[PDB]
């Protein structure tokens, strides 16, 4: 294939059982993006997978906060936190990659959200805005300056990963038809707006696949 250059990477965000139909935080139709992701990954020299990877006592779970229910919000030290159903607990079926995901060439699996008291939608920086995950250092050591983001959810882990990539100096693109969103209280269109404002490029898979 006519692959993307060595300075670009595909970051495949949270294509896990937990976020796909049948999972504990199932995003409708999120499994339908997987064939596109599998095909895209073949076109990149460098591919990183992310995995939401929570301990059972994670702060982002509604179940760990008395009197709160999923999809409500809570004020934590670091700001507003959406509370979720328990999802993607370390070592469980829910946290596994979706069985249709097929990227044997993937070079890194970075887990996130493993600190009990801090969420991390972004693969680059945790929800405290200060705890760096290691991904920036990894990518820059490998000479990567351009990041393409796909996966689930468009408006949370994808958007926050993309916005953090921009903050860290990467040319950042999101491949829209290889993402699926959840849209809580208008989050989906707001994520696209904030991403566009910050210079994230919104592209379609055919844009990349037609030069592969």
| Active site (catalytic) residues | 14, 112, 157
Residue 104 CB, shortest distance to ligand VGL, in Å, is 23
Asked if 52 is part of the footprint of Zn ion (rule: CB under 5 A), the reply reads yes
Taking the chain, what is the end-to-end CA distance rounded to the nearest angstrom?
6
- The size of the interface with ligand VGL (CB under 6 A), counted in residues, is 9
Pick the piece of the chain touching Zn ion (CB under 5 A) from 62-70, 110-118, 125-133, 186-194. 110-118
Among the listed residues 132, 130, 195, the one whose alpha carbon sits nearest the alpha carbon of residue 158: 195
Asked if 129 is part of the footprint of Cl ion (rule: CB under 5 A), the reply reads no
Pick from 53, 84, 148, 170: which binds ligand VGL (CB under 6 A)? 84
Distance, CA of 98 to CA of 17 (rounded, Å): 5
Asked if 14 is part of the footprint of Zn ion (rule: CB under 5 A), the reply reads no
Residue in the shown chain whose Cβ atom is closest to Zn ion: 52
Asked if 87 is part of the footprint of Cl ion (rule: CB under 5 A), the reply reads no
What counts of helices (H) and strands (E) characterise the chain?
5, 8
Asked if 124 is part of the footprint of ligand VGL (rule: CB under 6 A), the reply reads no
Asked if 126 is part of the footprint of Zn ion (rule: CB under 5 A), the reply reads no
The 3-state secondary structure of 123-168 reads CCECCCCCCECCHHHHHHHCCCCEEEEEEECHHHHHHHHHHHHHHC
Q: Which does 93 bind (CB under 5 to 8 A by kind): Zn ion, ligand VGL, Cl ion, none?
A: Cl ion
Asked if 48 and 142 touch (Cβ cutoff 8 Å), the reply is: no
Asked if 94 is part of the footprint of ligand VGL (rule: CB under 6 A), the reply reads no
Distance, CA of 179 to CA of 194 (rounded, Å): 16
Asked if 204 and 179 touch (Cβ cutoff 8 Å), the reply is: no
Which chain residues interact with Zn ion by CB under 5 A? 52, 113
Q: Which residues bind ligand VGL (CB under 6 A)?
A: 14, 19, 52, 84, 121, 152-153, 156-157
């Amino acid at each position: 294939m006519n692959k993307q250059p060595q300075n670009s990477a595909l970051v495949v965000v949270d294509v896990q059982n937990g976020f796909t139909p049948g999972g504990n935080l199932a995003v409708a139709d999120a499994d339908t993006i997987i064939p596109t992701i599998n095909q895209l990954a073949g076109c990149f020299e460098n591919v990183v997978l992310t995995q939401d990877w929570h301990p059972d006592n994670h702060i982002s779970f509604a179940a760990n906060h008395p009197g709160k229910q999923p999809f409500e919000t809570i004020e934590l030290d670091y700001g507003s936190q959406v509370l979720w159903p328990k999802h993607c607990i370390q070592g469980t079926h829910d946290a596994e990659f979706h069985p249709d995901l097929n990227i044997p060439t993937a070079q890194l699996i970075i887990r996130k959200g493993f600190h009990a008291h801090i969420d991390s939608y972004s693969a680059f920086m945790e929800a405290d805005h200060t705890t760096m995950t290691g991904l920036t250092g990894y990518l820059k050591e490998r000479g990567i300056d351009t990041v393409y983001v796909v996966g689930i959810a468009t408006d949370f882990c994808v958007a926050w990963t993309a916005l953090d990539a921009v903050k860290q100096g990467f040319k950042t693109l999101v491949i829209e038809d290889a993402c699926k969103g959840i849209d809580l209280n208008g989050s989906l269109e707001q994520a696209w707006q904030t991403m566009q404002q910050q210079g994230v490029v919104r592209i379609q898979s055919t844009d990349l696949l037609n030069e592969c």
